[PDB]
Design a protein around this ligand. Structure first.
Ligand SMILES: CCCCCCCCCCCCCCCC(=O)O
Ligand SMILES: CCCCCCCCCCCCCCCC(=O)O
Lengths: 178, 268, 123, 57, 256, 256, 268, 57
């Protein structure tokens, strides 16, 4: 899916159940494969440390007749990633109601024990886990597609900051480009 | 200094800071206090290591070439470009147009090439580096008449001292340097396509002023660029692929990111 | 062009290793070496440039992951270097329980995948 | 004609500088220009979008 | 310039956006507050966790079928095992908490139905057998919903609960339940209901384990309907948020 | 007109009367307080239970024999399973708490001995084997005390903790431990020791489960002695009271 | 300046400055005048060489490593730590938390390794030292692409001059450096135990920019630390034992002091 | 912006200093901070203990 535009689409649908999981990934804006290539992650990979809050905006790209309800949750470290909606409910969540507005904003706050966190993988500077769950279900009428996609946009808040400069691990070279 | 957090309490109102519309192409200006209860925090953190000047103001090796004191290769020549290397090129192509003064440093190091010659006894090597703007008489040999440098700027450096360094002005006919050019050099839409149309910054030459010894010595010169007083406009997305040629933006297609086991996996 | 660049994760395919002549515009192809899975995003191909140099090469394969060491009874497992191909986990017991078996377990390549050759001790 | 300015200090001191060359393209790079304006790139909409209000009305 | 159809509620570290909802109902005109020093009786200093206990808790969903009678939740016993609210409730002897109930059910413009969300204080429930009262394993089940019935429960020698939907389990007309704070969910208009309830009791504080202050009942008055081809699984989700909760009487853990 | 030998301390719903005690030691001259808004880093609103968590907790006693080397308690891990203090510590990610330690040991005018009560911050402990660090099942045991040794622990292939009393387990002279807040119990003078400790760290808050801020050590410098005919069982009791405790980062329960 | 003595005379009072109670854990504030008759002495002695900054502000060798201009070992790499040596480590572990700027000096010395090669004639050797923060592309070879140092700080030093030296800021995510850590890196109480949890200060590399001669030369680099502007908290007792590993506080048990002939012997 | 301070002299003289760098983490170490406060470690008792008085009363 990385050699496509499908890497960008979050595939929600209508199922005979309630409380299942949509996606999930850890809060590492510059090391995790999900975040290491956005504009934020590309700027981070030039700096050793980072600090501040994160904005995650989710936009529903289904029909105008489809209706849904989701739970978007952040859970700080100390216990593993939640495996059930009830466990995720106990963290910092937002209930998204898909109405006339097509977008909702989950703001991941700064809950570090230090002032700054390392961009590279480090157990001591743990970030937490971000997950999504079906609050209710995606109810569609007849003659309307039941399989829909969400899209996620990442942004930094006005209290974000980065520290020591370093070289990017991405660009590489074996001879001089002539 | 980053904005301090504002303490907030519970809410049961009609204000909806969370729900927005991304279609308008507008980034939301939401703070954490809109979606939860927060405390008052005073932030002393500063965005001082994020200024474009500070980010780009660091010396970087853009090229290195070698010359000898015997044989056919007696002098070295480089057409100046900042696209030969990967690191500074990628750092500079975050923006479309840039404008900066330059600080130029050279690091020259000699090395005794192996030879059967005996009774070797070298003296202090002295090097000359010369800059020829477009239209100058380029040296065709090492003992040429153009190394007089009547108007061309030149530096003489004896081995065993602090490395040479000079300051360069903007030196551009255009109001800003262009990192990207979408067009050709001829009005008939053929010829040189791309940023090679605007690269006319001149040529650089280096030689040994003396031979020093009766044994062959190979000298290597490394060139370090440092942008000072930088002004940047029109930010652009970073290179996802790997650079291939300095002259063209030709690339080999690559995946958008790396893969993971599943959409619900917290391990890369 | 000279012999293609050597990588720490990939090796030239069968036609390329034998070939000793590479004209301009020639494409060679790599393959994952044992114990290395292939990253889908990167393409394992190198073209010969006009300056008689190959195109930039990046590692086209990543190390494989041995299965979770599991949970030993009445003891602990250090897992110091992680669980990638070539790791080494150590075993220990609490005060009053004697370790019987092997002390370590290297992650090695057993067949088509990577496995921990040493079994779990009992204590 | 010396310039006295403030150094970079932590939160929660002055330095002196003289220019020796007559070109102004030869002076030390300016490491103290902390000025931000994200309005050009973020929030570029012609009509102002108040946060608490519905984006589409 | 906004619309009164959307609404957001923030409590602790949780937030709930309705987008399409009717006006919030506030108990008996009273907003939940703390206990006054002129109405108190217990002399030791109370504890007020504030953020840990006063947050949105989301129970497990149920399914709205075409023949669903209805469901009920005893409010103190639903959150008994959830988060730090349940923990403090066990150790302490006396507690006092207000609630916010947010019921959610969405459907398409081609689905039809009508639910009644009623917060009933002191909802004592009768028994199928006249001789004995209903058991606890029958009256209240935490972590799940309790369902009503469409036919009268058989009498005999048991400790069951009479579950007839029309009698509401309390020997009253289900239509007359609109005396308590109530909200209606109409699938053609609403998608959620929000009711804020203060603390109601004849005493300043009480033991939550042995006494249930209020019982939340959701009953489909008009059945669910749709035409073949549209989504057949339509769930109903309930979110509860303890408000101004405080406890007195710290001792050993457990209600034994 | 009173005597400075008696003293009472009230915290929450607990009270401790010494009757015969030396002057209370207060950390580094600092009294434990809350976190200031100019030194904070985490942006969410903290919780402050106040009475539920800040009360006297009494651990299980130990026995002072004639040849007892000494005992140690990692302070955050001792109260991990006790009351609502342990419960909030599990659910929350960050915590910040000050302590009050009250050690009690009484004896008759014919018994002799001397204990040293020292609160040591960041008491990292070495291992019997140089190659590997000591295990958790060895470094800290909650609900019980950890004992020192009189003879050097045998080295080999293990994850034991070096327990020599003279080296204090930290490669330092036990006599030089009087640099940290310390109090001496002399059976001919004292019967109890009281030390108030503030929050010490390089960070504003921290995870209690993976990091121990301070370790309380009681060591008999002068041995216990008596003449035949008098009481031979002399215990030592330790009481800890969390002060100005607060937590940030409410999530799922457990430290997994 | 130390307090001056106060003259005293005889006494027959009820004041008892000598008798105290050590159980209270309080040090007595008694002067010599309480227990004897004294004269007035004005003391000009000063406690100026006892300030923590002055005590810790002295350069100390923390490590030294060697590299060659031929063969397999062409460059040197060190993960930065102040626990490799004994002297500065013991001086720094008088306190729990410290906070200081750093002054870094390097002393590089070459030495002609014995060889059968003849007609040897060397040129001036030039060395490069590079600093890679955590997450950087570490050099896998000597002629790698990362020695361009686009953003990584680097120094070029030619042999035969004053030794190189730069100033380092606090560079810590924590409010103070920790010399001791009581805890693990994982929340499950397993993994790395101790101060190794917080050591993420980066890596240092050193190489020859040229080969210089046709004969092998081995260069040794020594690294000197100097703490400036030091702030210290929570004093701790000095190490009685001898350090064994830099990573762990593991020690071999040792006696409290040295022994003497008898409790009434004035000779060690 | 030069700073004139006093040198270290015996008991029983001024020097001049200029800062050339703009970082404040690059200035000379401060060798003149003679300030003492042993109250935190010595005499840490909550109740003041006058010397001439009996410690236990
Ligand atoms: C010995 C004296 C030598 C002087 C040589 C001067 C060379 C000037 C080079 C200017 C480089 C300008 C790079 C512009 C890059 C761009 O187009 O963005
Ligand atoms: C050529 C330039 C090289 C620059 C190298 C910079 C290395 C910085 C090292 C910082 C060491 C900090 C030591 C902290 C010790 C502690 O934790 O107490």
């Amino acid at each position: 899916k990385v050699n496509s535009m499908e890497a960008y689409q979050i595939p929600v649908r209508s199922n005979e159940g309630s409380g299942t999981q949509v996606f999930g990934f850890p809060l590492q804006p510059g090391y995790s494969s999900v975040f290491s290539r956005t504009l934020l992650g590309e700027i981070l990979n030039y700096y050793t440390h980072w600090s501040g809050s994160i904005k995650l905006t989710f936009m529903f790209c289904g029909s105008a007749m489809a209706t849904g309800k989701f739970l978007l949750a952040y859970s700080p470290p100390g216990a593993g990633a939640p495996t059930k909606r009830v466990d995720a409910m106990l963290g910092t969540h937002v209930v998204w109601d898909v109405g006339l507005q097509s977008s909702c904003v989950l703001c991941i706050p700064w809950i570090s024990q230090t002032h700054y966190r390392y961009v590279t993988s480090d157990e001591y500077t743990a970030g937490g886990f971000i997950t999504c769950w079906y609050q209710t279900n995606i109810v569609v009428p007849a003659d309307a597609q039941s399989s829909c996609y969400i899209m996620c946009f990442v942004s930094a808040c006005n209290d974000f900051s980065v520290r020591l400069l370093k070289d990017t691990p991405f660009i590489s070279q074996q001879n001089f480009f002539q | 200094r980053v904005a301090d957090t504002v303490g907030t309490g519970p809410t049961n109102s009609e204000a909806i800071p969370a729900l927005t519309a991304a279609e308008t192409g507008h980034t939301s200006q939401v703070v954490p206090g809109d979606t939860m209860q927060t405390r008052h925090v005073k932030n002393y953190h500063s965005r001082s290591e994020s200024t474009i000047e500070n980010f780009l103001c660091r010396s970087a090796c853009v090229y290195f070439t070698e010359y000898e004191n015997s044989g056919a290769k007696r002098y070295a020549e480089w057409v100046l470009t900042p696209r030969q290397a990967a690191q500074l090129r990628r750092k500079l192509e975050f923006f479309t147009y840039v404008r900066f003064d330059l600080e130029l440093t050279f690091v020259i190091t000699s090395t005794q090439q192996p030879s059967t010659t005996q009774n070797q006894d070298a003296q202090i090597l002295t090097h000359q580096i010369m800059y020829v703007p477009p239209g100058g008489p380029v040296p065709d040999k090492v003992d040429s008449y153009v190394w007089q440098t009547s108007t061309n700027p030149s530096v003489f450096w004896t081995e065993g001292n602090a490395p040479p360094r000079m300051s360069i002005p903007f030196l551009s006919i255009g109001n800003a340097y262009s990192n990207f050019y979408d067009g050709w050099s001829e009005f008939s839409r053929n010829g040189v396509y791309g940023i090679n149309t605007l690269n006319n910054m001149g040529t650089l030459y280096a030689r040994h002023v003396n031979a020093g010894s009766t044994g062959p010595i190979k000298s290597t010169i490394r060139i370090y660029f440092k942008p000072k007083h930088v002004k940047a406009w029109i930010p652009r997305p970073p290179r996802l692929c790997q650079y291939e040629k300095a002259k063209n933006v030709n690339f080999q297609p690559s995946g958008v990111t790396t893969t993971r086991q599943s959409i619900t996996t917290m391990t890369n | 062009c000279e012999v293609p660049t050597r990588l720490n994760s990939a090796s030239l395919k069968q036609p390329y290793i034998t070939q000793n002549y590479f004209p301009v515009g020639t494409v060679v192809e790599y393959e994952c070496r044992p114990g290395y899975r292939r990253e889908p995003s990167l393409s394992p191909k190198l073209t010969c440039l006009q300056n008689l140099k190959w195109s930039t090469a990046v590692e086209f394969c990543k190390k494989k992951s041995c299965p979770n060491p599991g949970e030993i009874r009445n003891g602990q497992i250090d897992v110091p270097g992680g669980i990638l191909f070539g790791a080494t986990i150590s075993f220990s017991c609490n005060t009053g329980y004697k370790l019987f078996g092997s002390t370590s377990s290297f992650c090695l390549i057993s067949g088509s995948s990577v496995q921990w050759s040493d079994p779990l001790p009992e204590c | 004609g010396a310039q006295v300015s403030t150094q970079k200090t932590g939160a929660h001191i002055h330095y002196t500088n003289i220019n020796y060359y007559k070109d102004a393209a030869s002076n030390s790079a300016n490491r103290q220009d902390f000025t931000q304006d994200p309005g050009k790139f973020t929030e570029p909409v012609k009509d102002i979008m108040i946060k608490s209000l519905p984006a589409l009305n | 310039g906004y619309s009164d159809r959307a609404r957001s509620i923030t409590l602790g570290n949780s937030t709930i956006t309705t987008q399409e909802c009717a006006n919030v109902v506030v108990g008996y005109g009273v907003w939940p507050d703390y206990l006054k020093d002129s109405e108190a009786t217990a002399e030791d200093q109370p504890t007020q966790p504030d953020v840990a206990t006063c947050r949105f808790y989301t129970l497990d969903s149920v399914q709205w079928q075409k023949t669903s009678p209805g469901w009920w939740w005893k409010l103190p016993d639903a959150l008994s095992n959830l988060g730090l609210f349940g923990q403090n409730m066990q150790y302490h002897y006396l507690g006092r908490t207000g609630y916010t109930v947010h019921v959610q059910c969405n459907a398409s413009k081609f689905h039809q139905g009508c639910l009644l969300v009623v917060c009933v204080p002191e909802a004592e429930m009768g028994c199928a057998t006249l001789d004995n009262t209903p058991s606890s394993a029958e009256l209240l089940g935490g972590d799940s919903a309790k369902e009503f019935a469409d036919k009268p429960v058989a009498s005999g020698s048991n400790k069951l609960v009479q579950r007839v939907v029309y009698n509401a389990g309390m020997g009253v007309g289900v239509g007359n339940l609109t005396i308590f704070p109530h909200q209606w969910i109409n699938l053609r208009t609403n998608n959620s209901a929000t009711i804020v309830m203060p603390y109601t009791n004849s005493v300043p504080m009480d033991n939550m384990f042995r006494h249930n202050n209020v019982t939340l009942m959701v009953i489909p008055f008009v059945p669910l309907d749709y035409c073949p081809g549209s989504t057949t699984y339509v769930p109903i989700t309930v979110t509860i948020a303890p408000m101004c909760a405080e406890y007195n009487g710290l001792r050993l853990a457990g209600h034994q």
